[PDB]
Write a protein that binds this ligand. Structure first.
Ligand SMILES: NC(=O)C1=CN([C@@H]2O[C@H](COP(=O)(O)OP(=O)(O)OC[C@H]3O[C@@H](n4cnc5c(N)ncnc54)[C@H](O)[C@@H]3O)[C@@H](O)[C@H]2O)C=CC1
Ligand SMILES: NC(=O)C1=CN([C@@H]2O[C@H](COP(=O)(O)OP(=O)(O)OC[C@H]3O[C@@H](n4cnc5c(N)ncnc54)[C@H](O)[C@@H]3O)[C@@H](O)[C@H]2O)C=CC1
Ligand SMILES: O=CNC1CCCCC1
Ligand SMILES: O=CNC1CCCCC1
Ligand SMILES: [Co+2]
Ligand SMILES: [Co+2]
Ligand SMILES: [Zn+2]
Ligand SMILES: [Zn+2]
Lengths: 374, 374
């Protein structure tokens, strides 16, 4: 009774930076060719969504943000072959077109159809499916999950197990997969190694999960909020350090602790200074450091290249290095086989209508992941 | 008839920065415990030696520089077990103590006994074996090969094949192994890939040799001295570009030429700007860039960490990543089995007494490697 028709529903519109989300009626157009309209069931509150509000991450406004989510297909456009109405799905903020040089490469996942490098805030065809107060509203990363209904391109959606608990597996759409894959796929943490994880939010906890699953012997959590330490130890940290407790720079502290530097370090905050600190604390001849956190837009860091000349490796990744459409269904299957846990990441549950309360919980430092239910 | 007693011989002493070498008589003390005194046979002129003259590379002066060489053992100190008088040897500017955490690691080579991170300019025991006009003269990287005789610690020397042609395999002591290993071992260049090599001197030509040996389909040489292009194509470059010929920045040019970025790039010059350019020109989702050139002392570069977050890998290495004492004898043995060629790197052969002329050739852009013969 809605297929082929405009849907009127509620969404959280961000009209301007540094303001609350506005929950209002929007019109959602029906899917065009190779597009999928999804009834949202659950969406997580990720720090990257907050970066849009704060201006850290620039994308066209007004916008419907949200990118970590799960829902049920309401209708499909012409030509769609990979999902059907009623299928459980996870939208993919990094697409998998399957046809570009990255999608065809054995290791890359930053598909050239992404909307991150040069954000337009549209569908792949350059237009919007959202209207509000007579105005077109932009999409975000081709997902826009802060809405009861969204429309995504087929290359930005993955079908998942029909028995999946959507209020939990939405985290596989961003936070969990990003952190876990950064450890197991990007760094390729080795058995018995020493790791340092800077930032113990949802993504940093998922990095710790991956480091533990890879068999690391020591996992040192680093955060300026000591209230984060208890959960970090629960999921695998052997030790936690607060840089504010020390008179020396923390890279010196970590270097003494690891008897000359860690095997693998991870920046999971989004600060230029901690990216350089994390690189410095890995062992100078063979350490690996992975940037996961997103820094403020268009800001350069300063570093001494002799840190690399001695033998260090420095890399970054989006979405844990996972090719999104291949990997998301396998990760859900793994969760359904109890190969990893997601409950440790979920600290709060709220109805979607309280999205602003959910963001203030994140900003206050109190929450890890708040899951919003539609 | 020289064992146990001081040797008078000629050496090229650098008394202060930005002066010609002074060829004069020095006194070489006999080797102490676990030290080796070597009669030099041939030594190459590497840009890193010129960095000492210019002050780009800071090390205590006055000094006997030189680190790319081959010679014959004159006498050994008490406790030496890995070489004997009469053995052909290559001094190692990166030692291999075999006992530190790096030496025991399967993939590291920057031995913690190195004299590069905080140069002292001495033997491992903190003293000098060189005297000139009654003044003590510092060592360089534990090698000091610009002398008819030098003394090195046993962890800084490798025994090589008794049949080795010393006037060619001296390049295995630095330039060739550094460039070749940067490609085959550090970058791990793959068959069919596209490579970009910035700097077509002795080390950059060896990088090209390594990329070709690894089966790269395209190898783009980058140099502002177009006189370097002919030799670069001889050893494997498919094409060469001079940044001064373009109105656009060269990372944009290389990205367009490679239809979206190269698989592997190498900075083999020693400039901060080309380090960042070489990183930018590799493919944003899966490219790898290796820093080989040495930056000027105590200078930081500036870069956008979003270059790494998209998926690039940035790394550096000393001596091609080779564990020095294990690898140098195998590389000589490989040379002897005709596995690679060294003659294309040698453009000039001069007597040791013409060391200053050899440096003038390097500074003028005319030479690749000048080999000095004693
Ligand atoms: N590369 C990718 O694909 C993705 C990147 N991100 C980015 O990952 C980063 C982390 O995201 P979340 O875990 O959701 O954020 P979060 O805000 O929940 O966790 C950040 C943690 O860093 C701590 N912290 C802040 N400043 C610190 C400092 N100077 N030193 C030590 N710790 C500090 C905070 O106390 C906090 O616990 C964000 O920048 C996010 O935008 C998130 C998902 C995907
Ligand atoms: N990582 C390691 O273990 C080692 C590092 N090195 C360093 O490698 C670098 C290269 O050494 P060599 O091949 O002996 O030096 P070289 O002086 O023979 O070659 C440098 C080349 O770079 C070119 N060049 C200079 N400025 C340029 C610019 N702005 N843009 C493009 N090209 C430019 C020059 O024309 C020249 O052909 C040096 O910095 C050396 O100190 C050398 C050996 C070992
Ligand atoms: O958190 C989800 N996506 C992120 C990926 C890194 C750039 C900012 C957006
Ligand atoms: O060229 C030989 N050794 C180099 C290695 C990199 C730092 C400067 C010295
Ligand atoms: Co996210
Ligand atoms: Co050298
Ligand atoms: Zn693609
Ligand atoms: Zn060692």
């Amino acid at each position: 009774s809605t297929a082929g028709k405009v849907i009127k529903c509620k969404a959280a519109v961000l009209w301007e930076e540094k303001k609350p989300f506005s929950i209002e009626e929007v019109e959602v157009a029906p899917p065009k060719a190779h597009e999928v309209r999804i009834k949202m069931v659950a969406t997580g509150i990720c720090r990257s969504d907050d970066h849009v509000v704060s201006g850290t991450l620039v994308t066209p406004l007004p916008v419907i943000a949200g990118h970590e989510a799960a829902g049920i297909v309401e209708s499909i456009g012409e030509g769609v072959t990979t999902v059907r109405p009623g299928d459980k799905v996870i939208p993919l903020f990094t697409p998998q077109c399957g046809k570009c040089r990255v999608c065809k490469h054995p290791e890359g996942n930053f598909c050239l159809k992404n909307d991150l490098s040069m954000p337009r805030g549209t569908m792949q065809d350059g237009t919007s499916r959202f209207t509000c107060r007579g105005k077109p509203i932009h999409h975000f990363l081709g997902t826009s999950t802060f809405s009861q209904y969204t429309v995504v391109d087929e290359i930005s959606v993955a079908k998942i197990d029909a028995a999946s608990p959507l209020e939990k597996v939405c985290l596989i759409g961003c936070g969990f997969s990003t952190g876990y894959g950064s450890a197991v796929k990007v760094a390729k943490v080795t058995q018995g190694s020493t790791c340092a994880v800077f930032g113990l939010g949802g993504v940093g906890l998922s990095v710790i999960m991956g480091c533990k699953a890879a068999g690391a012997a020591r996992i040192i959590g680093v955060d300026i909020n000591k209230d984060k330490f208890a959960k970090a130890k629960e999921v695998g940290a052997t030790e936690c350090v607060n840089p504010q407790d020390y008179k020396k720079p923390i890279q010196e502290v970590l270097t003494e602790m690891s008897n000359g530097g860690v095997d693998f370090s991870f920046e999971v905050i989004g600060r230029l200074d901690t990216m350089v600190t994390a690189l410095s604390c890995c062992q100078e001849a063979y350490g690996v450091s992975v940037i996961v956190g997103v820094p403020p837009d268009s800001q350069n860091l300063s570093m001494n290249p002799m840190l690399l000349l001695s033998g260090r490796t420095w890399k970054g990744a989006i979405f844990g290095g996972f090719k999104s459409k291949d990997s998301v269904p396998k990760l859900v299957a793994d969760f359904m086989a109890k190969k990893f846990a997601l409950d440790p990441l979920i600290t709060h549950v709220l109805p979607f209508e309280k999205i602003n309360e959910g963001f203030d919980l994140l900003r206050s430092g109190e929450s890890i992941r708040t899951i919003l239910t539609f």
